């Protein structure tokens, strides 16, 4: 289950590298 902020689009997100993907997901999780 993935939750994206009101300012994040999923189409451009999956297009980003995994290493950067994890850092962005870890940020939405630490605060999420």
């Amino acid at each position: 289950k993935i939750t994206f902020p009101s300012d994040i689009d999923p189409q451009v997100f999956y297009e980003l590298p995994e290493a950067v993907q994890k850092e962005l997901l870890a940020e939405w999780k630490r605060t999420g």
Binding site: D7, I8, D9, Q11, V12, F13, E15, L16, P17, V20, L24, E27
Partner: protein
């Protein structure tokens, strides 16, 4: 040569640049248009992080090329 920059929200921007333009310059372009500073915006091309000490031709970027912008925290 121009390049398209898609943001995390899907915002696409076309900025005219040159094969000898430095990554630090392209970043400034998004700053004057998106109002985002260089110390927080990140440009990635083909899963590679662009360095502020190189030129577009050094990363093999050509016209109509598209890059991805990742926001930092600061």
């Amino acid at each position: 040569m121009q390049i398209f920059v898609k943001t995390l929200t899907g915002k696409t921007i076309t900025l005219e640049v040159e094969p000898s333009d430095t990554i630090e310059n392209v970043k400034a372009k998004i700053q004057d248009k998106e109002g985002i500073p260089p110390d927080q915006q990140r440009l990635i091309f083909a899963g590679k992080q662009l360095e502020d000490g190189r030129t577009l031709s050094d990363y093999n970027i050509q016209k109509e090329s598209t890059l991805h912008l990742v926001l930092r925290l600061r």
